[PDB]
A paper describes a structure:
Two prime animal MAP families that bind tubulin and are recruited to microtubule plus ends by EB proteins (either directly or indirectly) are the Cytoplasmic Linker-Associated Protein (CLASP) family and the XMAP215 family of microtubule polymerases.
To determine the structure of H.s. CLASP1 TOG1 we crystallized a selenomethionine-substituted construct embodying residues 1 to 257 and collected a 2.15 Å resolution single wavelength anomalous diffraction dataset. The structure was refined to R and Rfree values of 19.0% and 24.4% respectively. CLASP TOG1 is an α-solenoid structure approximately 65 Å in length, consisting of six HRs designated HR A through F. The second HR triad (HRs D-F) is translated relative to the axis of the first HR triad, introducing a jog in the α-solenoid that gives the domain a flat, paddle-like architecture, rather than an elongated spiral common to other α-solenoid structures. Interestingly, while XMAP215 family TOG domains are primarily conserved across the HR A-C intra-HEAT loops, animal CLASP family TOG1 conservation is primarily focused along the surface formed by the HR C-E intra-HR loops.
Residue numbers in the entry: 1 to 234
Write the structure that this text describes.
Amino acid sequence: MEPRMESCLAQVLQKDVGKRLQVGQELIDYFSDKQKSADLEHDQTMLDKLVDGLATSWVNSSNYKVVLLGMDILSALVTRLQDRFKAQIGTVLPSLIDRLGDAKDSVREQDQTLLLKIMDQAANPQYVWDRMLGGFKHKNFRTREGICLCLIATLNASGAQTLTLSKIVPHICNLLGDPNSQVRDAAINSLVEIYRHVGERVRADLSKKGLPQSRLNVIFTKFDEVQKSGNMIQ
């Protein structure tokens, strides 16, 4: 193609899957080359349009290879733009949140990898998580599970100090009574991980939330197991 923003935008908007598979990597090279893409933030309007095209069209593609490649292009953008990507986070998040529950595990996993990278280079964990809480109520059980997993992954990447956990825990608690057993496991797991990073405070928070006692029993027993194993992180 051409090393120009209108050329790249056009290759992002065009909807031929074969051509997308062919130029995804060229788009990556363009954004990761400061000379070829020196004009990147000259026109904020078509920068916005390009991110938007990736999020709405590539990420939502029915071809999972297009989804993964689109996520990769986004990833190159984050590396190139750093904190200036913060302006784009809101635009990309709904489709990334959805794709935490995609049919393909490879997509769920790269999606998490990208999300973590956005938290690391475009903003911070809490700015992104303030905007992801909607995912807890997503109708696809694989997305609710994905949110809990992504929270675990976040604790390990950045530590509990970077999250306002008191904001997030109520949502997980809601997930404890999920119709889906995998979502319920994932939520219990999330609470166990939080406890590993934070300790007894979580047990107090949880006890004051009017959960059924059956639920409290399962979780607290698991907390006790963590203590027994000296598996605390902190």
